[PDB]
C-alpha cells in the first residue's frame, strides 16, 4: 500500500496522441495485487475544454538489477522512432482505461494482475490540436486504491505543466532526424524557425544535410510546411552526402525585414567530421565554406546562396563558421552573426562577424577567447554587444563585452561563474524596455541548466545586464534528455518563444509569458 | 598513375538491387582528371546471362584525417537501413554508367571531373532473379583510362565471387532486425531457417521479440512468406517488449520429420538484459522459460509452445537456454540441443539435453567446461557426440566429447587450439560417407575465422573427424563486418547450405559445394 508518483516537467505536445502526464511506481506490490481505481484532479482554472483524452497504462515490471528508484523501464513515446513519435509504443505500454470527456476530478480501472515487487503504470494526456500554447494543466493523482484499499501516495507532482508543439519529429518528411535550432520574429510578427535536415541519419557534417526552415504566422499555434532555405545537392558531381551544409544562424535585418540565414557547407571530407577535417585554404576543395541566403518575403522563398568564405576566413584557419543559432540587428542598424574559427594550430575561438551596409560586406576582428566554440551574441547596451560562449573548459559559459564589434574584448563580471553549462549551445537574446510589459531592459538566456549531459532546458531572465540571474527568475522547461540546443526570441511584447532540442521532439516550440519569468 | 582495385568476397545477393562487384581508390588526382573509362572482363564459362545490369558509380573522396588505404568513404549498400537494404544509398554513389548487355568485356565510362588527391568509384553488379545459388562470377578490372592514358593497376582482386540471397532485410514485415540463425533440412529436402524478429531494434532479450521461420522448397532459391513459429504476445497482461522470446535452436528428428523448436522466453525483467537478470526459481516472474514448439506438418504450422522448464532446470540456476542455430537426431534415434546455463554464482557452461521418447521428455546431465556458453554437438562417431563451444577465456573454441549423453566429458585434441575465434556462435555439423558425393565421412564448421571482431565467416572441412582443419578445405564468404552467427545444414549430396547475419543481409542463405571444400 505504498505508491510513487512522478509529474515530470516535460511538454505537453498539442500534436502529439500520448504524452505522460504522471508516471508510477508501485515497488513492493504481492503477486496479484490490482489498482482497481487512480482518481486525478485538474485545478479549477484548468481549460479541460482543450483535453481530448486521458488513459491509463501499464508497463509491466522492473530489471531485478535496474533498482527500486525509477519511474519507468523504458521511454514510453520516442523522440526518434521514425516510424512513431507520437504515441505510446503499444510493446512497452498496454492501454488500462480511458476517459474521451474529462472534469475536474476523473477515475481510471484497471484490473491487471501485478507481478511480485516494482509494478509501473502511466498517465497519457492528449490535447486538442488547438489547444492554446499558453494553456496549463495543474494536476494530482489524488487517490490510488490497490485490492479495495486506499495507498498511500508520496512523490513531487506539484508540477505546473506547459503545452508545446513538435515543429519537427525523427523521421518527418523522410528525414531521420533535425537538429541545431535557430529562431527569429519578422517585423511582421512571424516566427522563422531554421535547423539541419539530417536526411541519413543524425550525426554532424560531413553528411546529408540541408538547411530546413518553419514558419509560423500565429505565434506558434501552426507552422507552415518545411522550406529548403539551403541545399548543395550534387555540386561538383560529389555525392549529396559530401554537400552538406548545416549549423544554421539566421537573423533578422530588423530595418528592411530582410531575413539572412548563413551556414557552413561542407564538400568532400568523405563520412567524417568537418571539425576535425576541415583544412586550410578557401576553396570548396579545401575547407568549409561560409554561404548565405536571404527572403525579401518574410521568410516565404530564399535566394540562391552566395559565398561569403573569401570576405572574412584567414586561409590559415583549419574552419571558420557561424555560431548556430541566430544573430542580431543592433541599434545603429549593424547586422551582426556570431562566429567561431578553428585556428593553423587547432585551437577554437568565438567571435562576432557584422555588416553596417544591410548584408553587401562582411568583416571580422579579434577573436573574444582561446577554446571557445559556439556562442551567441546580445546588444546589452546602445553600442555595447555581450558575446556568450561554449567554453571547452566546461562548467560554465565564457562572457565578454566589446564596444568595437570584436576589435577589443573586456572579460565581463559573469564569465566563468553565473551560467552553468555541460559545453553545449546556448541561446542569449536582449529586449528593449519599449518592447515589453515589464518595461525594463530585459536579458533571456536558455540552455541545458547542468554541468553534465543534456537536460532541464531552463530559460534564465536578468533585470541588470546579465550581472545576476536570480534563481526567481527561471522557468524549467525539459527535465529529461535531449540533444539539448535552443533558440529564443521574443513571440510579442508578452510572450518569449523557444525553438529547442527537446525530451520530446528534435524541434519543439513553445512559448512562456515573460509575467512567469518575473513575477 | 596508380589505381587500387578491391575485389570484396562477399556474397552477391540474387535479390538485391546493387551489390559491390569492384571498388576502386584512385589516390593522387589532379583536380580535374577524368576516369574516361574502366575494362572489366569476365571468365570464359561465366554466365553472364544471368547478369541484368553493371553500373559504375562515383563516391567522391576521403576524409583529410582517415589515410590513403581505405577502397570506400561509407558502407555503399546498407544492411541496417529499414527505408533501403537493397540499393545503394543515393546520397553516397552518383551513377556514372550503366551496361545491360553483359559480355566478357564491358567497358564503363565517365565525365566526372576528379578532386585533388583520393577518389572512390565502385562497380555495381545486379543479378537475375532467378539466378542459380551455385553460380561464380570470376572478373578482373583489367584496363582504368585517367584522361585517355591506361593507368598502372593495383590491388588483390582475383576472388571467386559467389551469389546468395537475403531470406530477411533489415525492415522486412515491419522488424528493425533479424538475428540468430538456426537451419536444418527435413526428410523431404525442405530448408528451415529461424531467427529472432527483433521488432523495436538489435538488443538482446529482454525485448519485443518472437521466433520467426523461413520455408524453401526449392533449395534455397525462393522462401515462402515469413511465419511466426513462437510469440508470447501480451502473455498475463505485461507488454510484449517484456515477453520476448528468442536465441532459437532447431532441430529435425529424421525418424518422423517432425520439426522442433526451442527458445527463451523472458517475461518482465524491464527494458535490461536477459544474460544479467535471469535469476534463481522457475516460474516466469522469476527466470526466464526453456519453451518448444513442433510442427508435423515440414513446417508449414507450429504447435501452441510448451514449458520445458520444469523438466530440466535446477532452480539455483540464474538462466538456462538452449545454445542457438540446430540440434540433431543421432543414429539410434536420440534427438539432442546443446543448452548453456548460468550457475548460483552467474558463470556459464555449455553442454547438452537430449529425448530419447521423440521429444516428450528431456534431460540434462553435467556442463562440459567452465566459463562457455552458445555450442552446437555432432555425432562424430556412433555414439560419440563432439560439443563445440564459445569459450570466454578468447581466442579458441572449446572441443569435448561425451559417450554417455554428458553424464561425462573429455577434451578433445582439437581444443583450444585447431579453430580460432572472437567468443562468437559457431555452427557444427556431421555428414556421413553414404550420404554425400564424396563418400568420406566430413566435418563441417562455420565462424568467423578471427580472434577479433566479426567477419572472414568461412565454411570449414574436416576430413577426420575435427581433428584436423587443413587451410585447402575452407570457402571464405564474407570478409566484411557483421554479426557473426550462422547455421549449416546439408542440402542434397553434394550442397552444404549456411544461413547466417553477414555483412549484406541480416538472414543470408548461401549454397556450396562439397567439392569446392574437398578438392
Redesign the interface.
Known sequence: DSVYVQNPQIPILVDRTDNVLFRIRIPDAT?GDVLNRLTIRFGNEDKLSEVKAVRLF?????????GRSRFA??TYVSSHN??NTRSA??????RQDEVTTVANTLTLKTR??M??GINYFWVSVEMDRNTSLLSKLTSTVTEVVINDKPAVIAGEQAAVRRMGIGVRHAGDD?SASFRIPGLVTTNKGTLLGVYDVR??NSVDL?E?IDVGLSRSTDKGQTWEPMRIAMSFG?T???????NGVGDPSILVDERTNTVWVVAAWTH?????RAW??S?PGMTP?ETAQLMMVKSTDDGRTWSESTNITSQVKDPSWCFLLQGPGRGITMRDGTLVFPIQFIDSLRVPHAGIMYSKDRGETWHIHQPARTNTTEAQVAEVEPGVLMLNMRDNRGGSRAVSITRDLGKSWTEHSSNRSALPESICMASLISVKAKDNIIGKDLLLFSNPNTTEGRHHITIKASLDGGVTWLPAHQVLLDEEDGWGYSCLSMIDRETVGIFYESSVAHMTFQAVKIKDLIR
Open positions: 503477486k501499464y508497463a509491466g515490471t522492473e530489471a531485478a538489477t535496474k523501464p523504458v521514425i516510424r509504443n503499444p510493446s512497452y505500454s498496454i491487471q494482475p507481478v511480485k523522410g536526411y541519413n560531413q546529408h550534387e561538383d558531381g560529389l555525392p549529396s552526402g559530401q568532400g571530407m568523405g563520412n567524417a576535425t577535417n583544412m576543395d
